[PDB]
Design a protein around this nucleic acid. Structure first.
Lengths: 243, 51, 51, 106, 47, 52, 114, 132
RNA sequence: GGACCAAGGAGUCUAACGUCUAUGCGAGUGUUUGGGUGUAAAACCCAUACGCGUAGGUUGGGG
RNA sequence: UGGUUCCUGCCGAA
């Protein structure tokens, strides 16, 4: 009801309509009834956010708007939910449907983006991975959330290796991912050991096994397999993080 | 595009973001009268831009 | 490829209503076919002449 | 050798006829009330068609005379013969529906 | 105020250019010694 | 109403708004995307160095 | 560069002087003392379309056409069209000398009084 | 023969530019085959029935291959059962397009095909049976 | 074959099969006899018919 | 029977 109106307001030619609608979404996402809604409403909301990004003129508003979309994932964390139980909450399931609709809409609308239009969506995906991993760190990697965020999000669409997914999206994943973990961790050698310890706090060694599975399947594309094997598997940071 | 209106020279910027609305299409920047400073301004506003 | 277009008043300003694209604008643009059809259509309103 | 240059023109003239005749016939339709009639010739015997006129006996079964029915705009053929039941009945229903929808000025 | 950050396409092309330049420079450094050995062998063979 | 869509029918008898043979209108976007740019050998000087 | 021309003269039809009805354009006949046109006389591709000044000519009708030669001043040279009225030719000349573009034909339909 | 498409479809020339960038910058013979197939005439691009496609999918080891048709994929109602597979081509008749979608498969354009298989990994190319 | 010169002056149109190419659709395809419409010999829409077509193995072998 | 209207390039017999 209000959701499709939010989509229309975000997909407006007027800038101020889109700004005020986004500020209203900041109040709207922290609500019960949107958490009650199925994934189709999340999908509509993400395509509205996509066209909300699509009019962002200068690169500093692009960076601001990408940071705001990071804050959108930052909304669905309550400090109570980390304290109460290791099991999932309904806020967390709404976050799962939220991020899941994000990657669905993004992998759909990926191939229509202009080469001039591309880099703001690239930085968007960078901020979104930062935000979702920040949600994981806020929950401090509860195993329910970790497993379901692997399966229903990452193993579901982007890291599936399916031909339905375009190759450039996991290539962009294996570009940003190493830098994103280091963003989570924050002379140089003390920095290295703090990074090492704080990285051993993290369950990332499970996450790299998805890429191991991706390289293992031979029906997968040899390009993405080969680039993961060349870039990611030859990283020095994994050796410093015992991976 | 460097382009002059009656006296002052303006840098005109065109973004794909404003493919629609061609009245609001061109962005205008007043260039400095210092030749060096205005070339520096060009290199600033065309940062991460093609050669 | 934007979703919708702001209607404009007779006084001329962004009316708050907007309309989605009719998806006809997503059609393929084939100027060869437009040319070949245009020649034959322009040959329609012709009166004959003779000696 | 002849070329139909007037194909665009004559149609216009014909609709002028279809205008002008209609002017004189202002409430009434231009065409009469024709029968729905199944075609001969086994290639076409599943096809139904517009016929010329009904018959005397059918118009009597409709409940009026053909001499009066020509004034009502119902085309009547004497030399046709009604030999199929369903053709006859469907055309009787057609006549009844035509009777239902007319209003006649005294 | 806020720093304009490099577009990611430039970063990917940057990584590719750096890896490519290292491969070409390493190969050319091998070529120099190899061409030296060729010149010595050809000196020997023509003697 | 006049031309239809994938949602509205056509209002023309048996007409469909016709399809594309290529989905993305920009070829240079596809060429410079990421993954073609992964799969491709390094390029030349883009003008030939004349030797001899 | 150094413009080679490969043929100074013109290419005339055989027996073109012998009759007044026969033109001087090249028409293929269907001794060898007549120079016949062929692709060997085609000029060098860098040197092609160059004035003795060393520019490429460009016809200019009005000021908007003159402004198209703004960047390529040293390569091209503006030539005023034959049918430009004398009010417009002086405006074109003032604009061109402001732009610093060599006009191939100044002083056409014009004089300098006082 | 032809070193260029004699057609003037703009989108076709776009695909020619894309596959000539591939056929220069790849080492697989695949894109060279695709480039040579793009030049072909309408007679030299005979249509491929979806029945012939399914009969081709009856080959061993082909069920996880993708199929590529430089030409038109046409429908045939003489088949009932059509497998869930991925077909890339130039043109799709709406009957054959509904056959592929209705079988859960996928109707692909050749740009998306180049994106999925730049080196032609795991593919099939089918040619229509020319008689005249 | 020629006194000279000017202008004019000679593979056009149509019909029937045929190849090739391009284009649209595709086992279908073909609006324009005709009707509706119109800013009116244009464009736009199209009912019923009709026309033409449709109704295993081995060896290799592009990849 | 006689005549049969612009250029250049490429291929080019009996």
């Amino acid at each position: 009801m209000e959701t499709s109106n939010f989509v229309k307001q975000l997909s407006s030619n007027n800038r101020k309509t889109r700004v005020n609608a986004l500020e209203a979404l900041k109040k709207y996402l922290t609500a019960k009834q949107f958490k009650e809604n199925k994934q189709i409403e999340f999908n509509k909301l993400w395509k509205g956010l996509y066209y909300a990004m699509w009019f962002s003129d200068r690169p500093r508003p692009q960076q601001r708007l990408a940071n705001e979309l990071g804050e959108l994932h930052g909304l669905y964390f309550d400090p109570k939910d980390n304290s109460t139980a290791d099991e999932l909450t309904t806020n967390d399931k709404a976050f799962i449907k939220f991020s899941r609709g994000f990657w669905k809409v993004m992998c759909f609308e990926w191939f229509n983006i202009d080469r001039y239009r591309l880099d703001k969506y690239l930085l968007l995906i960078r901020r979104v991975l930062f935000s979702q991993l920040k949600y994981l760190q806020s929950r401090n990697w509860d195993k329910k959330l970790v497993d379901e965020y692997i399966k229903k999000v990452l193993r579901w669409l982007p890291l599936s290796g399916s031909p339905k997914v375009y190759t450039g999206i996991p290539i962009h994943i294996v570009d940003i991912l190493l830098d994103e973990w280091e963003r989570l961790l924050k002379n140089k050698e003390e920095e290295m050991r703090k990074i090492a310890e704080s990285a051993k706090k993290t369950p990332l060694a499970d996450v790299i096994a998805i890429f191991q599975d991706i390289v293992a399947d031979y029906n997968n594309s040899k390009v993405l397999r080969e680039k993961i094997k060349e870039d990611l598997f030859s990283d020095t940071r994994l050796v410093s993080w015992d991976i | 595009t460097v382009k002059c209106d009656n006296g002052k020279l303006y840098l005109y910027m065109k973004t794909p973001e404003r493919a629609h609305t061609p009245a609001k299409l061109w962005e205008r920047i007043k260039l400095s009268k210092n030749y060096t400073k205005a070339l520096q301004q060009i290199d600033e506003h065309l940062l991460h831009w093609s050669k | 490829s934007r979703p919708q277009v702001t209607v404009h008043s007779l006084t001329g300003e962004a009316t708050a209503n907007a309309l989605p694209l009719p998806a006809v604008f997503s059609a393929p643009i084939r100027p060869d076919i437009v040319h070949t059809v245009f020649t034959s259509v322009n040959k329609n309103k012709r009166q004959a002449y003779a000696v | 050798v002849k070329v139909h240059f007037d194909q665009a023109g004559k149609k216009v003239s014909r609709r002028n006829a279809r205008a002008t005749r209609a002017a004189k016939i202002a409430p009434r339709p231009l065409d009469l009330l024709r029968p729905v009639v199944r075609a001969p010739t086994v290639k076409y015997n599943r096809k139904v068609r517009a016929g010329r006129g009904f018959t005397l006996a059918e118009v009597k079964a409709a409940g009026l005379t053909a001499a009066y029915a020509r004034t009502i705009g119902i085309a009547v053929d004497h030399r046709r013969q009604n030999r199929n039941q369903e053709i006859f009945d469907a055309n009787v229903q057609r006549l009844k529906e035509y009777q239902s929808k007319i209003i006649v000025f005294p | 105020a806020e720093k304009i950050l490099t577009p990611e396409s430039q970063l990917k092309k940057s990584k590719a250019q750096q890896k490519t330049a290292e491969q070409v420079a390493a190969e050319r450094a091998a070529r120099k010694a190899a061409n030296k050995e060729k010149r010595a062998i050809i000196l020997e063979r023509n003697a | 109403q006049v031309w239809g869509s994938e949602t509205v029918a056509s209002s023309k008898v048996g007409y469909t708004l016709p399809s594309h043979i290529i989905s993305t209108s920009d070829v240079t976007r596809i060429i410079n995307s990421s993954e073609i740019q992964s799969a491709i050998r390094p390029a030349g000087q883009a003008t030939q160095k004349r030797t001899h | 560069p150094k413009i080679v021309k490969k043929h100074t003269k013109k290419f005339k039809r055989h027996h073109s002087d012998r009759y007044h009805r026969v033109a001087e354009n090249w028409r293929k006949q269907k001794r060898g003392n007549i120079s016949q046109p062929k692709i060997g006389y085609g000029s060098n591709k860098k040197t092609k379309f160059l004035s003795p000044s060393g520019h490429k000519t460009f016809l200019v009708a009005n000021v908007k056409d003159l402004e198209t030669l703004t960047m390529h001043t040293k390569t091209y040279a503006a030539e005023i069209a034959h049918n430009i009225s004398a009010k417009n030719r002086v405006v074109i000349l003032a604009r061109a000398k402001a732009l610093g573009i060599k006009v191939t034909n100044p002083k056409g339909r014009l004089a300098l009084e006082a | 023969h032809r070193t260029a498409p004699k057609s003037d479809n703009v989108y076709l020339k776009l695909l020619v530019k894309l596959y000539t960038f591939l056929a220069r910058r790849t080492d697989a013979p695949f894109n060279k085959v695709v480039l040579k197939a793009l030049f072909l005439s309408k007679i030299n691009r005979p249509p491929v029935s979806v029945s012939r496609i399914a009969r081709a999918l009856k080959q061993e080891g082909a069920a996880n291959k993708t199929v590529v048709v430089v030409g038109t994929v046409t429908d045939d109602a003489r088949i009932f059962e059509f497998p869930k597979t991925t077909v890339a081509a130039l043109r799709f008749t709406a009957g054959a397009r509904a056959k592929i979608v209705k079988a859960g498969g996928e109707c692909i354009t050749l740009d998306q095909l180049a994106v999925r298989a730049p080196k032609g990994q795991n593919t099939l190319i089918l040619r229509g049976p020319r008689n005249s």
